[PDB]
Every structure is written in C-alpha cells, then in structure tokens.
C-alpha cells in the first residue's frame, strides 16, 4: 500500500500537541526492519524546525561492531498538526508514514506505527516500562491488527 497514508483503521491521535512530544524517547520494542537491524539501546529525538516539520535523530548501539551510530531525518505532518499522522525521510530509501496511535495524557508512553502493519514501536520517556504498560501496549497493538510476535524487546539501561 501507499507509504504516505496510515494503515487503514489505526487510531491516529487527533488532539496532538507537538510540543509535548519533543525531545527524547527510548525504543522499548520494535518490529525489526532493515533500517534498524543490529541496534540496541535505541533512542529517537525530535526537535522543531522553522519550516513546520521535525528534525529526527535516532541513535543506537551495535554490539557486534562495538559502536554507536546515529541517523538524522525529517518528519512532516501529512495534514493538520493536531493530527499525529506524519511521514519521515532519511538518507536513501528510508521514507514513509509515522503515526502516533496511542499516547498517555502525560506524553510518557507512545505506540507509533509506520505506513503498514509491518512497522510498530513501543516508546517511552524512560528506558524501562512497567509490565502493566507493556501489557496494555501489546493489547492495543493486537486490537489494531498488528502481529505482536514481530516485536523484539530492545536492550536498554536497566531492562
């Protein structure tokens, strides 16, 4: 399907406050994909741009090579900035939808999907999350049609 639209049916957050989502997030779990392959301790960082999009810097550690790496990209809303439907673009052939489909009131925990059900992330402001938050994230993922067998639990400080 189009790499520009959300997966059909997902619950895009429609009262989004972009300022509250800025800064750094820890990747608690991801569906594994080429872009991120081999990485642990992954974080994503968002900053505002003058042009109304977001600067994205993802960082992680590759324990096979013993080195940190970083990737810088840009995200732009696909519609109104109060709707958490975006597209993100990195160097090369890494481009597609970015959608926040679950978020707590305090912007502490997020479930983010790509443009299809092969792309999903559990993110947190903290490097670890409680089992209850894990359970709820998997429950939401399942209810929205995603195959939670695809998740890998990303090593983080204290995991």
Place of tokens 């042009």: 51
Name every residue whose Cβ is closer than 8 Å to that of residue 35 and which is 6 or more positions away in sequence: 71, 90, 94
Beta strands in 63-145 (DSSP E): 67-77, 85-89, 95-103, 109-113, 120-124
Count the residues of the shown chain that bind a copy of itself, applying the rule CB under 8 A. 23
91 binds a copy of itself (CB under 8 A): yes
Percentage helix, strand, coil, to 5, in the chain? 15, 40, 45
36 binds a copy of itself (CB under 8 A): yes
Q: Is 111 helix (H, G, I), strand (E, B) or coil?
A: strand
Q: Please report, as ranges, the residues that interact with ligand Q3J according to CB under 6 A.
A: 27, 35-36, 42, 44, 58, 88, 94, 96, 98, 112, 114-115, 119, 121, 123
Which tokens is 138 given?
A: 């998997």
Of 74 and 136, the one with the shorter C-beta distance to ligand Q3J is 74
Stretch that binds a copy of itself, among 14-22, 34-42, 119-127, 141-149 (CB under 8 A): 34-42
Closest listed residue to residue 82, CA positions, set 113, 96, 57, 103: 103
Q: In angstroms, what is the minimal distance from the CB of 107 to a copy of itself? A: 25
Q: In angstroms, what is the minimal distance from the CB of 54 to a copy of itself? A: 13
Q: In angstroms, what is the minimal distance from the CB of 142 to ligand Q3J? A: 18
Q: Is 75 helix (H, G, I), strand (E, B) or coil?
A: strand
Q: Which does 38 bind (CB under 5 to 8 A by kind): ligand Q3J, a copy of itself, none?
A: a copy of itself
Stretch that binds a copy of itself, among 10-18, 72-80, 103-111, 116-124 (CB under 8 A): 72-80
């Amino acid at each position: 399907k189009s790499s520009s639209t959300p997966p059909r049916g997902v619950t895009v957050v429609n009262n989004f406050d972009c300022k509250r989502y800025l800064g750094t997030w820890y990747e608690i779990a991801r569906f594994d994909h080429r872009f991120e392959r081999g990485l642990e301790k992954v974080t994503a960082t968002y900053s505002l741009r003058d042009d109304g999009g977001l600067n994205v810097i993802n960082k992680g550690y590759n324990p096979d090579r013993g080195m940190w790496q970083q990737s810088e990209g840009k995200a732009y809303f696909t519609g109104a900035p109060t709707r958490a439907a975006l597209k993100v673009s990195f160097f090369g052939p890494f481009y597609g939808g970015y959608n926040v489909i679950a978020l707590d009131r305090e912007y502490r925990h997020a479930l983010v999907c790509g443009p299809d059900r092969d792309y999903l992330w559990i993110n947190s402001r903290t490097p670890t999350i409680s089992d209850e938050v894990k359970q709820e994230m998997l429950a939401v993922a399942t209810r929205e049609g995603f195959d939670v067998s695809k998740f890998i639990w990303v090593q983080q400080p204290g995991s």
